[PDB]
Ligand binder design. Structure first.
Ligand SMILES: *[C@@H]1O[C@H](CO)[C@@H](O[C@@H]2O[C@H](CO)[C@@H](O)[C@H](O)[C@H]2NC(C)=O)[C@H](O)[C@H]1NC(C)=O
Ligand SMILES: *[C@@H]1O[C@H](CO)[C@@H](O)[C@H](O)[C@H]1NC(C)=O
Ligand SMILES: *[C@@H]1O[C@H](CO)[C@@H](O)[C@H](O)[C@H]1NC(C)=O
Lengths: 131, 231, 228, 231, 224
């Protein structure tokens, strides 16, 4: 029944929240959130490159957790306009903790076949990156 | 009160939201009304319109002509020059353009109501603080749900240069007066800001009584394995 | 260049930051700086200063007539009068007085800094929001600890009339930039505001790094599987 | 050794790494070494090649020809047909078609050394499991620290059909023997697996000294702001 | 069709565990499915049983006989010689024996299932890595709850020679697919490995969901 304010795919951090009535009066009401983080125990400093150390340090900037980078339309009198929804999305790619299952993560490898080296693009998330 | 020339830049409203921006070439400090000549060098688009002479507080006249249909040139960073012949004595020129080349896209922050003003269930002040924009002019609107609020309900404060060293930046603030009843119900309110040195036209931020400050937040940390993939 | 007479009240700075208040009767529409001889009637007190060397861009002249010793009658709410007689216009007259009918003690709130600035380093933005009565004149200052900060460090906006009906009130906002380091270290910042009707001249509100309602944040860890 | 016709697919390595995709059409049984005739239904202009016949252990003769350039057609799921004329008889026909129905790519899981040998250092065994894939051929290579490892040091086993009901699937296991010194120093190893049912030709998984867990492990988890504005 | 004699080594199955092991003497490359006389010179007193002739795809014939009586002397290093009178012309000879010259006992290692599978429930892959047999033959079976599982449930991969110098060994692998529920509930699983050069008739290793594990991760959650 809670409203989902944020659902990040890099740092699973579903932040729901709902109007919980108080115990003092029926008019007065309280707000409570549910920051549900999911920290990876097995992931490298960076997930785009598999030759980096394991990740033992995680920091979650709330602003970055509840982001919005999907332009929206607005009925400004008689002119519907596109709308940037934040002042953060500005790409250098941002630091990312977990793989976004809906994004393709790959690495280049120099494999030698028929006598010569070839740069083969191999999946890091083989259960995704489908057509 | 001597003759002098200046060019009045196009309004940001016409450049970002409207459909037809225009540039005005204006002479002031004139004793002889009318009879002045205003010629634009980029004689394209639509013909400029000569306006009637108007007296200022000193009795001297202001005489100007406006060139419309110039938004397309400005959107490329183009330039305009005006040459004028005084109604009395001389040849005077000037230029403008829509290109500063040291801009800072805006950062829009919203400040929810103070506790002192929401504990009473009266009226609330939503404060929109847009920060950093080098060409000083801002389009500020507010939205209530998915509809625009009338401009008479906003207090939008003019831009002021920020103190300190480094690149020049400026602040603008606006306050929207909101009924605590609709805030209680959960109606969303948002600040919409325009500024040219910024992509996808305008920028916006939205707040309600959910994004605002919570009470007794619950945090649940889950350690994960698998492939490290978020699904 | 038509003649006129008006009266300018003392600056609020002249009636709260100590007492050095005067009323300036302006004599306008002159074509000669010698101008005119003017008289006084603010209760009593023989003290006048006449500055004649003032011109507009129109080239026409104005005279600034300063009457010191006016603070007490502003505190009482009493009136003042000024009169002049010009070779250019004859007699010009006018009065001034403190307005009490729509004068209401102020309402000041402070807005802690936004979230994005707290996640970042560099700087922050503390906002002071002030509600003004109809005869509005506001002195906005800030404190870093117990020290007064120079006006050169503030960004203060002019008042704008609020929407509504039944009374005229204005809003002003001011922004102070605060170093993230002194914010995290516990330096206190405050907004001081001076206003006409406020019994103690000045009011103050403060912002700390802990300002607001404290919370019981519940934190737990789940070692079980399921990921997310 | 009775007269017969059979067709053979391209090598998976030719399909995934190289560009020389080809199909082999083979006659068997016949008693005459003399040249036979091969007809390729695609009727390409490219030079289909009849190569060299081979005598078998019983003196039986095997003949074959190769159709080159079977690249985009296999990637598109197109079928191929071959008609042959025996020197001793008439004509035989057959076809090859790609499986486009149960094209399931493998799931790859890597395992660290077992504890018994790990406690002794010496030489360790890393292992790669490739499971639940349908087509009967897989490319498996083992890597070093971002560097290919020579095939003479890894041991790859043939695919073997899985038990139970469902689409036909196979397992493949492989073992890479690893000096305990490179393990202790954390040299990064990886299993590289390639297949035609995988949208990308290959997938990779990695092992290193931290693929499991040290006996003293901790994680720093910081929630910043918490009570901030969640947009 | 080139005549040739070969003797088939006794298979591990029936050897270290069964009664009445046997050795087979086989002529190949024949044009006549009759007349081969398989004389046996271990002189145990047992008569080898003549088997029916079979043909290759080309028609060449193969004819063989089987001597009962093997394990008691074969595992002792005895040399079983066979001379066969050829159906058409001449004789052929050969021998069989357990070769104890340079043998190596196995090492059995079990690997728990990967976390990537455990996170998904379904079925888990329990793997038995059997390293360093001198020759190629091995018997690999599993136990579930200490009961033997049917051959149909295995995936055992053909012996392959181990890489490296100064050695003559083989490596074998096997995978068992186990419901995640039985693993989580604590059913015991074991790998049984049989081979000639051995102290017993069953070398095995066991695995469970539990072991001494590095799993106490200290998670310092900080509200800042
Ligand atoms: C994750 O690491 C990778 C590995 O370098 C970075 O992404 C690649 O960087 C190379 C070298 O600059 C580029 O050629 C590629 O285009 C990058 N990959 C992609 C998909 O664009 C990446 O910078 C790392 N992330 C962080 C935050 O450091
Ligand atoms: C935490 O809960 C207790 C329960 O009575 C309450 O007394 C206390 O004020 C709460 N603290 C905060 C910071 O909300
Ligand atoms: C936990 O840490 C202690 C520290 O001495 C160690 O003895 C133990 O093996 C670790 N693992 C578990 C599962 O307790």
């Amino acid at each position: 029944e809670a409203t989902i304010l944020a659902d990040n795919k890099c740092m699973c951090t579903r932040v729901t929240s709902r109007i919980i009535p108080s115990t003092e009066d029926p008019n007065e009401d309280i707000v409570e959130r549910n920051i549900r983080i999911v920290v990876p125990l097995n992931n490298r400093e960076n997930i785009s490159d598999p030759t980096s150390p394991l990740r033992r340090n995680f920091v979650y900037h709330l602003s970055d957790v509840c982001k919005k980078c999907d332009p929206v339309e607005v009925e400004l009198e008689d002119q519907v306009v596109t709308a940037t929804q934040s002042n953060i999305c500005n790409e250098v790619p941002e630091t990312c903790y977990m793989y976004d299952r809906n994004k393709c993560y790959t690495t280049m490898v120099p494999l030698r076949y028929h006598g010569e080296t070839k740069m083969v693009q191999a999946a890091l998330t083989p259960d995704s990156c489908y057509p | 009160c001597q003759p002098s020339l200046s060019l009045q830049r196009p309004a940001l409203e016409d450049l970002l939201l409207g459909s037809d921006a225009s540039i005005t070439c204006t002479l002031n400090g004139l004793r002889n009304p009318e009879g002045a000549v205003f010629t634009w060098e980029p004689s394209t688009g639509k013909d400029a319109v000569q306006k009637k002479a108007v007296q200022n507080s000193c009795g001297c006249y202001s005489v100007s002509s406006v060139l419309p249909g110039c938004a397309e040139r400005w959107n490329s960073g183009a330039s305009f020059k005006c040459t004028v012949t005084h109604p009395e004595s001389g040849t005077l020129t000037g230029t403008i353009a829509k290109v500063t080349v040291n801009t800072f896209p805006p950062q829009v922050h919203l400040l929810p109501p103070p506790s002192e003003e929401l504990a009473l269930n009266e009226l609330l002040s939503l404060t929109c603080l847009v920060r950093a924009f080098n060409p000083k002019e801002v389009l500020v609107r507010w939205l209530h749900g998915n509809e625009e609020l009338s401009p008479e309900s906003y207090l939008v404060f003019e831009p002021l240069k920020e103190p300190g060293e480094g690149a020049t930046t400026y602040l603008v603030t606006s306050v929207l007066r909101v009924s605590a009843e609709t805030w209680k119900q959960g109606d969303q309110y948002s600040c919409m800001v325009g500024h040219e040195a910024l992509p996808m036209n305008f920028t916006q931020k939205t707040i309600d009584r959910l994004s605002g400050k919570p009470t007794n937040v619950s945090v649940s940390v889950i350690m994960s394995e698998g492939d490290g993939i978020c699904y």
